[PDB]
Symmetry: D2
Subunit: 403 residues, 4 copies
Amino acid sequence: DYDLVVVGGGIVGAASAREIVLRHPSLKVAVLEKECKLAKHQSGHNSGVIHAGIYYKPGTLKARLCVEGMHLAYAYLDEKKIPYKKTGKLIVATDEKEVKLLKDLEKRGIANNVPDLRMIEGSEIQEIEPYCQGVMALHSPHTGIVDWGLVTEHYGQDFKQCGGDIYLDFNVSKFTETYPVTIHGAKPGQTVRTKNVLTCGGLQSDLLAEKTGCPRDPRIVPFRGEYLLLTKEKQHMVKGNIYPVPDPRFPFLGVHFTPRMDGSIWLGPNAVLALKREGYTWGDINLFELFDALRYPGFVKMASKYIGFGLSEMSKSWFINLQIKALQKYIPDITEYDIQRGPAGVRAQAMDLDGNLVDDFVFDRGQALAKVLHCRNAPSPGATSSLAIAKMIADKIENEFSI
Amino acid sequence: GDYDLVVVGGGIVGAASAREIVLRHPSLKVAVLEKECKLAKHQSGHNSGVIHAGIYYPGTLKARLCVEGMHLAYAYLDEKKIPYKKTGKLIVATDEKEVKLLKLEKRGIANNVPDLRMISEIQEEPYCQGVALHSPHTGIVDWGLVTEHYGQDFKQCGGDIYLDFNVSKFTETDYPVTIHGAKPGQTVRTKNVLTCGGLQSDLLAEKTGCPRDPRIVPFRGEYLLLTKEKQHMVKGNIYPVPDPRFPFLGVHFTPRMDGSIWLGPNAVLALKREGYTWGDINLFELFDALRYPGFVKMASKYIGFGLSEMSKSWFINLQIKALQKYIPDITEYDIQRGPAGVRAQAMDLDGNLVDDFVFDRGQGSGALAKRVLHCRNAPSPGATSSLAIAKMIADKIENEFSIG
Amino acid sequence: DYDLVVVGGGIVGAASAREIVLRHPLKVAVLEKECKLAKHQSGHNSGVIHAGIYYKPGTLKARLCVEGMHLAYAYLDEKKIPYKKTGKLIVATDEKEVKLLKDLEKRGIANNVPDLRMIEGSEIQEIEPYCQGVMALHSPHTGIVDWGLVTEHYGQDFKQCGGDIYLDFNVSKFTETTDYPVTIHGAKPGQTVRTKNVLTCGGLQSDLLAEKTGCPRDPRIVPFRGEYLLLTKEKQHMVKGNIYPVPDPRFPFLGVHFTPRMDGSIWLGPNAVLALKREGYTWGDINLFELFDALRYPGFVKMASKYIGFGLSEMSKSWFINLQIKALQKYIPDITEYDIQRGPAGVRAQAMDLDGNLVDDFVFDRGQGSGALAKRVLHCRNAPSPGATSSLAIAKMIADKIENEFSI
Amino acid sequence: GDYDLVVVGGGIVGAASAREIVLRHPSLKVAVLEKECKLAKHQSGHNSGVIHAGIYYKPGTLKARLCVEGMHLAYAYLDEKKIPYKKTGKLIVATDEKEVKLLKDLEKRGINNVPDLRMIEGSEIQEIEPYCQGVMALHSPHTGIVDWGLVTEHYGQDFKQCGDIYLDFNVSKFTYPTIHGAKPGQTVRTKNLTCGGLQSDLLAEKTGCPRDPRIVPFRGEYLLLTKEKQHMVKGNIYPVPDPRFPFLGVHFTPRMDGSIWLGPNAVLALKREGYTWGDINLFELFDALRYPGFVKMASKYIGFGLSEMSKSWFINLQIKALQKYIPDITEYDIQRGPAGVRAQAMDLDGNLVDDFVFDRGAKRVLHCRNAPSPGATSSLAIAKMIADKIENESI
Ligand SMILES: Cc1cc2nc3c(=O)[nH]c(=O)nc-3n(C[C@H](O)[C@H](O)[C@H](O)COP(=O)(O)OP(=O)(O)OC[C@H]3O[C@@H](n4cnc5c(N)ncnc54)[C@H](O)[C@@H]3O)c2cc1C
Ligand SMILES: Cc1cc2nc3c(=O)[nH]c(=O)nc-3n(C[C@H](O)[C@H](O)[C@H](O)COP(=O)(O)OP(=O)(O)OC[C@H]3O[C@@H](n4cnc5c(N)ncnc54)[C@H](O)[C@@H]3O)c2cc1C
Ligand SMILES: Cc1cc2nc3c(=O)[nH]c(=O)nc-3n(C[C@H](O)[C@H](O)[C@H](O)COP(=O)(O)OP(=O)(O)OC[C@H]3O[C@@H](n4cnc5c(N)ncnc54)[C@H](O)[C@@H]3O)c2cc1C
Ligand SMILES: Cc1cc2nc3c(=O)[nH]c(=O)nc-3n(C[C@H](O)[C@H](O)[C@H](O)COP(=O)(O)OP(=O)(O)OC[C@H]3O[C@@H](n4cnc5c(N)ncnc54)[C@H](O)[C@@H]3O)c2cc1C
Ligand SMILES: CCCCCCCCCCCCO[C@@H]1O[C@H](CO)[C@@H](O[C@H]2O[C@H](CO)[C@@H](O)[C@H](O)[C@H]2O)[C@H](O)[C@H]1O
Ligand SMILES: CCCCCCCCCCCCO[C@@H]1O[C@H](CO)[C@@H](O[C@H]2O[C@H](CO)[C@@H](O)[C@H](O)[C@H]2O)[C@H](O)[C@H]1O
Ligand SMILES: CCCCCCCCCCCCO[C@@H]1O[C@H](CO)[C@@H](O[C@H]2O[C@H](CO)[C@@H](O)[C@H](O)[C@H]2O)[C@H](O)[C@H]1O
Ligand SMILES: CCCCCCCCCCCCO[C@@H]1O[C@H](CO)[C@@H](O[C@H]2O[C@H](CO)[C@@H](O)[C@H](O)[C@H]2O)[C@H](O)[C@H]1O
């Protein structure tokens, strides 16, 4: 019924299916999503920041796609008239040990050609954020905030305006050979036949790849990202984004202060090991989803080296008074009575056999069903670089299937 | 939009109640809010699918609603032209004590289950044995499809079904109550509210002012699928003689409209409200069910019964020794594990399992109170008695909400 | 240093050591890890002296019981050890239990149990006026005793003939050095004992000690806690003797029985609950090393495949004692939950093969090869039930087994 | 009726008090009731055997008063009875400039009338420990190595030679107005204290004392350095610990037999006598976790306690911290050794008790629920304080 279908209604799958039919309008492209609407998981529960590209090492792939995607996104928001607020980004250092890291993020950010990056001292910190302390800060006024869930839906809008079809409530559960390939949903009779596919399963990147002939690695390890909602009384204390100086050994950016479109400013997210693939709450646990997460060889290797950082993140979440004490190192005007537990997101972090966290493209196919391409990982961050990542995925697909 | 009445629940009880209230009053502006993407996505979409004739329940309301609902169901199935098969039920006894309990025959004759005969005798079910009761008016149907037709009739009467509407907060506003969904900006204004939340009967009732009791204790009903190489060994429904102390009818043989033979369901306590799998655990929803005062009181009396259900689930080989008492030519190789349903069992603070109607509301004569009525439980079988209990739910809200 | 070492100060190890020194007046020592002898199974038992009623006629388990019973009474009177000889009344609950009790009557008189006599009706009131039932089986020769006190007398006779008892000696390792090739190391540093041959009756650790020589993991020791209930002193007059239920013949467990102790107390038990620890006498005692290994045993998965229902039954009645009372009221109905109290417990050293069966026979095992430790250290990994009553008979069997394995 | 005074607990505290009591009044009928077979089978038998100089303790405090006095009393007792010991330096070593500040406060608090407190510079470090690095350090040569289990046996040896140690006596309930044991018939009546280490809270509840202060077991795990490199550690090597906790941190310490133990750490034991990780007790966890003060301390000190468990789960991380002192140790050079359990008392607000705590019901009983640290070196000094409190409550 179709030529190629994209499995995944996330911002990556929507932007890829959009980009491929814009350049090739003669291709019947469909999209299968297991949920009611688009961007229900990662791209629907994010902090909503358009990143400038500072943390990523120059000359790498992630440093190029982020800077290119940040300009492609801003140009896309004006064409579609999507609301967005360009607020300041302050990477504030609190002691003499973090400014050395801040000085590395300084030279690393300038090499990526981020627009108008300045390094302010403690005197000018209140000039951008009057309520924030710090020894030194890094100001990136080009960063902005946007609802990536609305951005994801606008991708699907332009997708089917060119002839696409978005099949929502379609839980892909099996691939069969009959248009040679055939896709089967969770409901009986719900089936779609095509020639090739391209999956962007996000949190189920590996499980979709296990139903074609790909190995278990790289396994998707769920990391919950919890947020705290500051009360409306003190929303004026944060004008823009206030980021901390993170540990460069991990891709996590740490809990930060971030405003949103609805005037709400949120505190987060953290790095909490989710005991469930879609474990948005701490109580929700799946025994089968962690027996494999524990029997995975790479998990024991990462835990052998980085168990202390994951447990202290879980410590600051068990007792939020510890998290407040950390946030007071930046804005000491916030107490435990000025916040309340909000929603959270889960990160689909890839992991190899050695325990490293993957931050690179991971395409895989079977060893008819083989030669079905699975995008098991995309470079961070997937939201800002979405349009740039889409073009790169729109190049891998045309050589794997000859379009 | 603004409405007169709002029904929270896309199940067979919420849809039939919403369908009944608009047929009696076509001038009403009634809406339906369902948190899932389709009607009958839980209990009404994960059931055995057999239409009961009320042979186990006389003089009460459940025995009247089931037989009346069974007659109204066959009339609705023929009017809307929905496929159904009169498979017939065969309640077989095995031991000598089960013969005394089956002599269930007197209660079924009083309830006027038509063509009820005490049978064992012969295999005129060929492969079934044992030392029985036949009622050929018991049939099977897709109750999930029946629920969709209730929504089709409700939409044809001017009603709107809001899907993906996860009700999360009732606040005060001509339409003095407003309803908040999960997504920001999802708002519906109404005058009076009726909730049929099924597995979330108590949680929805808590957002108005109702007490914790009765609590909804999840009981997962796992099913085993007899493979196609032996589906011919069961022609109609073959039920065992159950313990009258529990509403669970025990693991039974039941054919489906697609020709498959399903074996079940059992009674395994789910570690989650929507725990359809054995491993899915919600520590919050688990601790509250156990810390509920009525749970330990019920566990102190019948935990051995629930443990044998779990043991037959952990080791399937123990389950077939029971099934071999009815059909001995079934091995461990002829069956596979299938899907499951979770029962919204209501339980009081004393431990007794609720089986009657439970309507609850607020207290202090406010706006959220008196205008939001919660159906915390409906008599079983809910699917078969759906058209029957919908008439009594419509009568309840007509009195409670004053409708013309 | 010594010619023979018997590790384990239980009733089986002390009887074998006492027997082996009387026949060969040999430098033999006894190593016990605990403070005193009979600190486990020999000191945490029902204290009943059985006659061969339940056991198969003509088998070794049935011969040893009546042989050890007659040897015990002769030994109790010889050493002036206090013992009370009441009766064991096995009552049937329903007609289905009358069929099993009829077989136990024929199975008991075949092994010469003096003197079996079936009773029924109002005759049950003549022996126990508070207990009911359809039919019963009377055994006037069944008595009670302090098996822990009996075990200490075995070591008393063992020391009265030149034997040395090593207390607080936790055997940790078996190494080789001659003339005494095998030395035995303890938990404390420097504590060592050299010997020519070693015999191990470790009870709950018979498989762990055998693993330190070269013996396989099977048969594994699976701990089964046996909890007791204390009948209040206000109703201890309601039971005059031993009231036993007819047990399932598939399991060696005799079932929760009414049993008086010689201090006047009436204990109701024991049950058969799986222990989360080899020496887990309480409900909360959990050792993850011993828990996560009893589950990884191949026989444990096979045994639970067929008898998990009987085990969860025992556990459910252990969590809610009201269920246990409803079972005991089928015999003496005037007992309620207010008339009981949680008491101490014992742990059975139940051996299990790889197929899941509970072995109840003699299991001797030595190391592999012609080395020093493999040919001089013999492990008794299981003894026939009951080890306490059959102690004198088991000791003679073990003594003959040692006389052949080591040529003394 | 048999004895006049009964000391429940045969640890180093119970043995020293019973020994001190009979020397003052040789006419008293005194007995010691120990649950285990030998004396010093628990806390006193499972320690680093260090005679503490007393450098961490604030001046003018009671803990600093008994430590400096008990250390001198212990050195006189070891020579009087000819007990083997070795006087090696402790050498408090620092790392970064942030650790030098706390090391400077340790030198000021010590100069508590500590003897011969010299501050090593850096090049002189190799003259005391040639394999240890660091920036600055604080030396004190009169610290000692000792078998505290051997000393406890000598305390009871004198007590038994001055007029009875009842071993295997698990004191159960209470009834010369009777002390019951675990075995039926095991009895002994007295006219007048308990010093149970990990059970001072449970013994007090047998006569009507409140649950507070509770005893929270903290397992102290040790690591045995390989015998092939048992020469890199000549004396003690202690890190600069966080002053908010009584734990001195994992340290290098040699034993009488030449072995060197690395530790102990502070890992929450899941059992009162939980000497290994897998040994847990559910009843003793609903005790500690449901305790009101435990949640208060956990809400403030969970991060430090979680990293301790992380270093215990993976020695991978533990040696990475030890290499900051001597960097010539690998993973194959270490091996998991034995451990001890700390009888840390905790009040209802979460604070860790560090002073004397005596509580009675009902009048003839007196439970020393806690004693100042370190109880091993302060054994003779603390015993003098316990003997003064029991004489007043009218010997
Ligand atoms: C807490 C959090 C905060 C973040 N904040 C930011 C930020 O501030 N800025 C930024 O640039 N990035 C941010 N990100 C990253 C960004 O959200 C993700 O990188 C991006 O959404 C990845 O796109 P995706 O489509 O792969 O994710 P997803 O949206 O999760 O894509 C997966 C989709 O596939 C569907 N699916 C899965 N399995 C199947 C199946 N079998 N059949 C059919 N459909 C299936 C899922 O339902 C889902 O819709 C954040 C991520 C997290 C977790
Ligand atoms: C395993 C099993 C087998 C059964 N077999 C039979 C049989 O053979 N024959 C028979 O007659 N009966 C049978 N039944 C009974 C029958 O299925 C139920 O009685 C019936 O489905 C009850 O109707 P309901 O509306 O409560 O269903 P439900 O679907 O459970 O109704 C609850 C609905 O409300 C929605 N909801 C909950 N909370 C919210 C919220 N906050 N906001 C919005 N929506 C919300 C849920 O998504 C759901 O759609 C069976 C039941 C079970 C569990
Ligand atoms: C609850 C219960 C009730 C019973 N009731 C009865 C009854 O009524 N009548 C009856 O006849 N029988 C009864 N028995 C059975 C009888 O008690 C046992 O069969 C018998 O006690 C076991 O003898 P043993 O010598 O093997 O025992 P144990 O006493 O268990 O012997 C093991 C000994 O080995 C020692 N040991 C272990 N490892 C080492 C080591 N490394 N170094 C040194 N020493 C070590 C232990 O300390 C211990 O003392 C009962 C058993 C139980 C559990
Ligand atoms: C890991 C660790 C390392 C240490 N290192 C050092 C060090 O280097 N230097 C230093 O000076 N100090 C050190 N200490 C401190 C010192 O070892 C202890 O503080 C000291 O032993 C406490 O004395 P105690 O008698 O109360 O202890 P314990 O020896 O525990 O005394 C309690 C005794 O009473 C018995 N008992 C308990 N309940 C009962 C009962 N009901 N009936 C009968 N008997 C009972 C117990 O069996 C035990 O023998 C260390 C402590 C620990 C835990
Ligand atoms: C499964 C077990 C293994 C777990 C896997 C490994 C997980 C690793 C997660 C690393 C921690 C998350 O990322 C971490 O966030 C914290 C908290 O914001 C940052 O912390 C930083 O900012 C916070 C406030 O925001 C300051 O109080 C803090 O002093 C500073 O270090 C770290 O710089 C960053 O490294
Ligand atoms: C607090 C939580 C603890 C659990 C609470 C109590 C839960 C009670 C569970 C009841 C068990 C389910 O319901 C029970 O099903 C079993 C097994 O199908 C039926 O059992 C019947 O049919 C089976 C075959 O299916 C026959 O082998 C059996 O001999 C017969 O009794 C029981 O008659 C019925 O009572
Ligand atoms: C870990 C997985 C495996 C679990 C282990 C399974 C072990 C098997 C358990 C056997 C149970 C103990 O042994 C069992 O005791 C019970 C209770 O006393 C006896 O039961 C008998 O007496 C009791 C009262 O005492 C009566 O209420 C009962 O009707 C009668 O049958 C059984 O006849 C006997 O079989
Ligand atoms: C129950 C949950 C809460 C747990 C309760 C609170 C437990 C508190 C324990 C704190 C940790 C133990 O004590 C802590 O030991 C560590 C490790 O040795 C010391 O750490 C010090 O020495 C180590 C080496 O040993 C160095 O690598 C480290 O850089 C240095 O800081 C800390 O200075 C001390 O504070």
